[PDB]
Structure 1
């Protein structure tokens, strides 16, 4: 069910790096429930999930509402890599990252979901 699977040749790495930079700019909603709140409230600019979920059904619900809100989603293959990409000390299973009016981070979100649009 991971048909937007991100490729380990550095697209995963740019995803997790932009996760970390958004974590340092506090633009980051972590975990599946808070990701779901950000997508349902429409604050979300991009959303990554983790395909290393042991039952992946517990994150399969957010591609629905991301298709409804028309925000790009993409899966990285490790919730541990996403977890310390956030800086959490636990495994983050699905992360959402928003934006503001003016930031270089918002530019990096723009180019990043341009690459996600090249996937989907």
Structure 2
């Protein structure tokens, strides 16, 4: 079902790294409801979805809206490790990041979404 899964070899690690960057940089919505609201406001730049979840249907409906908006998403394999990367003290299955158009973080995100677009 979750066929655009992210592969292991440190690709997930650059993902979690940029998640840490954006979580410090406040460009971040956290939790699935925040993801849906961000993508339905269209501010989202990219969204990461856990696959380690009690049933996957949540991170199956979220790709429906990001497919409805044509903005990228990617399946991390670990909800716990994603929550730790965000710094929540709690596991998170869905984290999204928006755009702020004056940085090089945006260059990083451009690279990352190029990676996931080549994954798809």
TM above 0.5: yes
What runs of 5+ residues in structure 1 fail to find an aligned partner? none
Stretches of 4+ aligned residues off by more than 3 angstroms: none
After TM superposition, the structure 1 stretch with the greater mean CA deviation from structure 2, 89-98 or 57-66, is 57-66
What runs of 5+ residues in structure 2 fail to find an aligned partner? none
Q: TM-score, normalised by structure 2?
A: 0.97
Deviations 1:64-112 (A, max 9, x none): 1101110111100000011011000000111101111111111111000
The offset of 1:59, in angstroms, is 2.2
Q: TM-score, normalised by structure 1?
A: 0.97
**RMSD across aligned positions (CA):** 0.7
The offset of 1:115, in angstroms, is 0.1
Deviations 1:38-71 (A, max 9, x none): 0111000001000001111122111011011101
Query: Matched residue of 1:21: which SS?
Result: helix
C-alpha separation between the residues in 1 aligned to 2:74 and 2:101? 23
C-alpha separation between the residues in 2 aligned to 1:113 and 1:27? 16
Query: Matched residue of 2:64: which SS?
Result: helix
